Design a binder for this molecule. Structure first.
Ligand SMILES: [K+]
Ligand SMILES: [K+]
Ligand SMILES: [K+]
Ligand SMILES: [K+]
Ligand SMILES: [K+]
Ligand SMILES: [K+]
Ligand SMILES: [K+]
Ligand SMILES: [K+]
Ligand SMILES: [K+]
Ligand SMILES: [K+]
Ligand SMILES: [K+]
Ligand SMILES: [K+]
Ligand SMILES: [K+]
Ligand SMILES: [K+]
Ligand SMILES: [K+]
Ligand SMILES: [K+]
Ligand SMILES: [K+]
Ligand SMILES: [K+]
Ligand SMILES: [Mg+2]
Ligand SMILES: [Mg+2]
Ligand SMILES: [Mg+2]
Ligand SMILES: [Mg+2]
Ligand SMILES: [Mg+2]
Ligand SMILES: [Mg+2]
Ligand SMILES: [Mg+2]
Ligand SMILES: [Mg+2]
Ligand SMILES: [Mg+2]
Ligand SMILES: [Mg+2]
Ligand SMILES: [Mg+2]
Ligand SMILES: [Mg+2]
Ligand SMILES: [Mg+2]
Ligand SMILES: [Mg+2]
Ligand SMILES: [Mg+2]
Ligand SMILES: [Mg+2]
Ligand SMILES: [Zn+2]
Lengths: 163, 186, 103, 49, 49, 98
RNA sequence: AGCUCAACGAGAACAGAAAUCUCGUGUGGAACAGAAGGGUAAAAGCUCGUUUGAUUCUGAUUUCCAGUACGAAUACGAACCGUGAAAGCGUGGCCUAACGAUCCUUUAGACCUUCGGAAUUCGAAGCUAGAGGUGUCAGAAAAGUUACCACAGGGAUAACUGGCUUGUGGCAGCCAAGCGUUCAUAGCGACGUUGCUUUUUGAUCCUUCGAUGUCGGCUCUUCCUAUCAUUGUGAAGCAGAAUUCACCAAGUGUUGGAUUGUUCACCCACCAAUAGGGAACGUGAGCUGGGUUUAGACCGUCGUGAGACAGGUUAGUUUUACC
RNA sequence: UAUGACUCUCUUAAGGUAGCCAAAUGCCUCGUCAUCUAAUUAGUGACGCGCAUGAAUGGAUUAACGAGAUUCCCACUGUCC
RNA sequence: UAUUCUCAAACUUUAAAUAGGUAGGACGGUGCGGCUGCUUUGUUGAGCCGCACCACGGAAUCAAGAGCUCCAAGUGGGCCAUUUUUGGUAAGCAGAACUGGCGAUGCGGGAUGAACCGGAAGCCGGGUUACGGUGCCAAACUGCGCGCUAACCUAGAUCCC
RNA sequence: CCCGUCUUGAAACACGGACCAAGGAGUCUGACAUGUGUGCGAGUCAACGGGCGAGUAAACCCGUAAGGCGUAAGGAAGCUGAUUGGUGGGAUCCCCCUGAGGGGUGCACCGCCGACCGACCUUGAUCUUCUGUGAAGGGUUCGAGUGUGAGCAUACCUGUCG
RNA sequence: GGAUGCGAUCAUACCAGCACUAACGCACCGGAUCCCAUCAGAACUCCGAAGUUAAGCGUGCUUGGGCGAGAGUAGUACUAGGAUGGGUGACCCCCUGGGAAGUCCUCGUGUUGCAUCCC
């Protein structure tokens, strides 16, 4: 409304991938969704029911409800000077389980194991990971050196493959 | 130039003294300023901060609610920075040690008859200088008529804010925007 | 009009400034009524200053039927039962009401 | 007399004066809009706990 | 972005200086404000003085 | 549009509370009564001097009306009303498409 | 549930480019109401069978967005149903547009509420849900004219100058196919292409609406050159005469008349020549007032009319300096 | 050749008759022809599918008259040289 | 049939840079027991609730602190600039995107100027700079060096200009 | 560079202003609302009026079942009318030990979910004046409600409106 | 090492042309009384086991097409930030960073879960 339809400017967003149209694989319907799971919203152009508005396409949210055919997704949306946690319902065909927290549980388990070992041996350690820092000095074996010099200019080589 | 907000100065305002001209309240403020400075007690600091507050920020506490909160702690001195009012819905009054800025006549009579005492804050300083064995209580701050009108506007969805109306009845703001049969509801 | 305020309905669209009644004469009216009362008492001495006797009547409607107040005057049936002639009752300080019915 | 039609100039600055504020997420979120049958069963389970 | 990065580096005035540990995150932050600052490897004499 | 003479549809009468057969007719607005309070008020306002006292709509824009179907349940004889989308030609029980 | 479309290839009497039929290939190149974009192949397309989920009840959410309403749409819940063997699907149209408040009227629903002294019955008034419409579509009930005119304002906005620009106008350049008895360049310059100017007209609306006197002519001064004549020169398809091209060059001059208010134009005549322009489209407290542009009046066309006209016509106040 | 005395038709009842005209009425337009001048977008006479003339919304003419609008000639002159 | 020149805002297999979303614990994990009218062939699951144990704070930097509420003013003509960009021959034209600036703001420089460069400011002393400059006007060299130019057209002389 | 003003932009060829003195423009009143000060408090308000009294327009005193506001709400109406909570954070205080610790305490406020009252729907043993009552059991519905009161009076600034 | 039934991924799996396959299977295949179905027992449905591996399914080959990966295109095109940078302009160099896509060339032509069966 108000000058723009619901699916305005969705020619590319809602179209299906090249040579990837037709029937939907059964893996889409064989997925399990639970409250608190992070999901990515990817509109399937062939499923016209439970279609989220184009804004939510390409955004990640958390599951807050589970119905027979759809899931409730809570997505952050910026409106002027604040963030609104908008709750929508989206059919499972338009959603995919997110990998934004795949390593979190693994990292927590390893941190707990390391802390337990440190306590066992009577030491205090920090399990925080660190950004890549400067490398130490090292020795490089001398080898044959190839000399690089600027190339003399030739106008005939200005075109790809030559004029 | 320096990249600071308002030259690094604060933009929050808080009370640093009572706005009242009550000389007794001023004396209490002096007493608790000294106590806060020379004891560093959290109870004393809270009392001093509350002594500055306005009337609506020092709501009264009903006698029945005071009894309910003091149940199981009758040996401690209950302290409220505010007024204590009587409740005709409370039947049994136990012996209580109560400190407040003011007591209503009925509440004071009932406490004294039940066998408690009504104390001022100077007496509280004499008895528990660091607020030991005290029960610090506050009245219901948001339980007033003006608060009902605050919050989301009455006309927006999911809003239960009270509207401002000169009279109550069928003809006073009930037809359009309040019913499905007259335009829209809410 | 602006903000969340009660809808105003002030009735001040006529020449209301020409119909304002002030009360700067309230003490003077009190004094005048007291003087009139004193003069009447002096005139009717030794008759009681409270006036003629009045009957006891019930309040009207369901809101006040439990209340007792003073009526205008005693009914003819009440006067007959008490043995006081209706033509004599007013002359001896008894108010008479020929309209009130006794139910 | 024609005038300007529209522009977003200064709007981001206005928003950032006090925003962008993230509402505080509480531990327990509202159950409004969830599956009514599931909510009914949860209420009965809580009552019989 | 430049102003925010300079605040995070604690450089609010012209000719203010600060030490910074070398990290991938810090280096990438500094790369954004390169035109507004000059930096290098301080000497022991420089740090002491 | 063409609608059938009869329709199997829900009836919320206490007698049925289920799907039942319904006879289909077209609703028609009834005659205005002089005893209606609005009409009485309008006549009182119009009486005397002052000419026309209420608006008279002139800027007609619609070229169609919303056709309302009266569905009378054959079990309890009670009537339900169902609007349909705007149309220029309406008929009930017309010949089926070939 | 069954089937597969457009198109093409090879075949069959009339029959051929195009009728119907057979086989093979056929990723949609067809169809799906409409604009376009998406989407669909044992289907969302075509054929057939059974049907009315285009049904009832309210709430939640999305889009618009103030996170209001309406429209539209989506996912559940509570019923009754259609189809299928069943899972399942169905809350109108494959999705993205196709629509409407208050007041009033009218219809549907209840062994519903009220008519206030008490009963019955008509009548009226209430509650819930639709319908009659506002297309200026968040929704007054609405014909002109004014040159007889008025007010509050606007340089937020036209009608001059000035400013930006230069399409258009005007004035130059470059290349060289050709013209020029032969010879591209004495003199020209097609097809192309680069510029300059603000004496054209446009484009814009920056200044001026508590006002910068709005055409033209007359008078008077000065300035420019893109030079008409005059001084000195080069070139020629320069024998002479005459003419043409070009270079220094703005010192001097560039006129008398008929018609028209005219700028402009066109003729007559003279002359060495009768060049082009600026200076608030120079110049109204310097004039004039013929024209445009108030009020009177006539004609033609238009309008029922009041009146209008980029059409014509006649009469119509030009103020003040002593700062 | 051109036009159409003549015949038939359409809108809407009829289809500009007698007259008059580049008019105080014609855009094109400073229309075309003759005349007036050395030269005339002026004047006069003539022509007329006349943008858009026309019959008491009166057409055509007209002696005499006019502080009415126009063109030319004689006389006259400081309007001008 | 195999090649070939040149193309697309309303074409496209492929496909950047910049920008957009989510997450990186104390609101966590593990092991037992319990509740249900929901769910399952199945105390099978789904949520929730009790007890026990562990949990060095779980990337960097910063954090002149964080959250919440009430009443209310003015404003709702904008304009300019790098880059992206539409109509237009173009415009000191007209219209959009991000950011900044002027408006509301002085100060040094660009001779002069709302927007350019520098830089933002309580009243003063000292020191040093930014942009820009050092022949005079006018504070600072006719400073130390290398080449080019000779303008008989007013040679030429500093982003916006 | 001349102030004031409107303006994107003023020293402006934008308007007002020859000069001086005095006068000269957000006030009073009514209805609300937030905030703050003061009194009392499930109440509060004597100034309609009455009794008096600075020989007195003041001050003082007076509320009988008076009245206003509040103390109960939901329904158009008939009419019905609050079974008295739980939980996660959380200030203060008390213990053990000196860890960003553990236990008890858990006001204000916020988040979440029950229960109760009423409109609507649904439900129905027993009684009953036969149309009422209500053992049990409810609901994606609705409310400017309840779950141990917070108002009343008065003063001032600010804001909307006549 | 396979086949069959049900699948996951949905071309490294597809398309075209050639060659091959023990056993169980899968098929082709024989009929139309019944259920069922059409113009047509072609298809679908039902009842069978005479015959065949001819076809289907499966496997292998093609200096095959397609498809997938790599190299290269190429630090090229493009692009974020800077400049009182060059240039009359059009455009462009440089500084701090990111960084594609045809042609050409090389390689490869499926991997797998559950259950039954043959070897
Ligand atoms: K308000
Ligand atoms: K009337
Ligand atoms: K449908
Ligand atoms: K409108
Ligand atoms: K009028
Ligand atoms: K030009
Ligand atoms: K102008
Ligand atoms: K003007
Ligand atoms: K002249
Ligand atoms: K005259
Ligand atoms: K006719
Ligand atoms: K006549
Ligand atoms: K005359
Ligand atoms: K406003
Ligand atoms: K002004
Ligand atoms: K002025
Ligand atoms: K009272
Ligand atoms: K009701
Ligand atoms: Mg009449
Ligand atoms: Mg099908
Ligand atoms: Mg309607
Ligand atoms: Mg009605
Ligand atoms: Mg030659
Ligand atoms: Mg010259
Ligand atoms: Mg000259
Ligand atoms: Mg006429
Ligand atoms: Mg004729
Ligand atoms: Mg005549
Ligand atoms: Mg973008
Ligand atoms: Mg700068
Ligand atoms: Mg200094
Ligand atoms: Mg009372
Ligand atoms: Mg074979
Ligand atoms: Mg190949
Ligand atoms: Zn029925």
């Amino acid at each position: 409304p108000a000058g723009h339809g619901l699916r305005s400017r969705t020619r590319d967003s809602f179209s299906r991938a090249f040579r990837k149209k037709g029937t939907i694989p059964l893996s889409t319907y064989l997925r399990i969704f639970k409250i608190g799971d992070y999901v990515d919203i990817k509109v399937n152009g062939a499923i016209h029911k439970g279609m989220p508005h184009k804004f939510y396409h390409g955004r990640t949210g958390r599951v807050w409800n589970v119905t027979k055919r759809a899931v409730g997704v809570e997505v952050n949306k910026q409106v002027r000077n604040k963030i609104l946690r908008k709750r929508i319902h989206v059919r499972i065909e338009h959603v995919q389980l997110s990998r934004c927290t795949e390593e979190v549980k693994e990292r927590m388990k390893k941190n707990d194991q390391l802390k337990a070992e440190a306590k066992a041996r009577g030491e205090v350690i920090s399990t925080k990971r660190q950004p890549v820092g400067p490398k130490p000095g090292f020795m490089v074996e001398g080898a044959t050196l190839e000399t690089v010099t600027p190339i003399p200019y030739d106008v005939v080589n200005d075109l790809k493959g030559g004029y | 130039g320096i990249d600071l907000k308002a030259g690094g100065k604060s933009k929050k305002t808080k009370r640093t003294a009572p706005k009242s001209d009550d000389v007794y309240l001023k004396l209490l403020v002096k007493l608790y300023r000294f106590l806060v400075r020379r004891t560093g007690s959290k109870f004393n600091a809270v009392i001093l901060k509350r002594l500055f507050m306005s009337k609506i920020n020092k709501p009264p506490l009903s006698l029945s609610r005071l009894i309910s909160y003091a149940k199981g702690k009758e040996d401690k001195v209950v302290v409220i920075v505010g007024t204590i009012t009587d409740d005709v819905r409370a039947y049994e009054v136990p012996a209580l040690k109560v400190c407040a800025l003011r007591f209503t006549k009925t509440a004071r009579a009932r406490i004294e008859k039940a066998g408690g005492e009504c104390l001022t804050f100077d007496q509280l300083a004499l008895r528990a200088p660091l607020g030991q064995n005290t029960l610090l209580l506050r009245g219901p701050k948001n339980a007033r008529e003006a608060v009902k009108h605050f919050g989301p506007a009455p006309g927006v969805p999911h809003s239960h804010t009270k509207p401002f109306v000169r009279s109550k009845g069928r003809k006073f703001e009930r037809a359009r925007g309040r019913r499905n049969s007259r335009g829209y509801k809410a | 009009m602006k903000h969340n305020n009660v809808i105003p309905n002030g009735h001040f669209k006529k020449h209301w400034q020409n119909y304002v009644r002030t009360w700067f004469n309230q003490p003077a009216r009190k004094t005048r009524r007291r003087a009139a009362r004193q003069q009447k008492a002096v005139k009717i001495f030794p008759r009681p200053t409270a006036g003629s006797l009045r009957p006891i009547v019930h309040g009207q409607t369901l809101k006040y039927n439990m209340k007792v107040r003073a009526g205008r005057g005693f009914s003819l049936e009440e006067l007959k039962a008490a043995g006081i002639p209706k033509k004599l009752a007013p002359t001896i300080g008894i108010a008479v009401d020929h309209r009130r019915r006794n139910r | 007399a024609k005038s300007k039609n529209h522009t977003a100039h200064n709007q981001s600055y206005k928003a950032h004066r006090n925003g962008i504020k993230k509402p505080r997420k509480h531990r327990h979120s509202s159950t409004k809009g969830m599956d009514p049958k599931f909510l009914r069963n949860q209420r009965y389970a809580r009552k019989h706990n | 972005q430049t102003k925010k990065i300079l605040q995070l580096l604690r450089l609010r005035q012209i000719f203010n200086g600060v030490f910074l540990k070398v990290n991938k995150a810090t280096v990438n932050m500094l790369h954004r404000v390169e035109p507004y600052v000059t930096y290098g490897y301080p000497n022991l004499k420089s740090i002491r003085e | 549009v063409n609608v059938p003479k009869t329709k199997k549809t829900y009836c919320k009468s206490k007698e049925c509370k289920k799907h039942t057969l319904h006879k289909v007719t077209q609703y028609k607005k009834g005659k205005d009564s002089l005893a209606a309070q609005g009409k009485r008020r309008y006549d009182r306002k119009q009486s005397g001097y002052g000419g026309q006292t209420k608006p008279v709509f002139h800027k007609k824009a619609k070229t169609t009306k919303k056709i309302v179907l009266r569905l009378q349940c054959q079990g309890c004889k009670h009537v339900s009303q169902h609007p349909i989308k705007r149309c220029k030609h309406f008929e009930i029980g017309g010949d089926k498409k070939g």
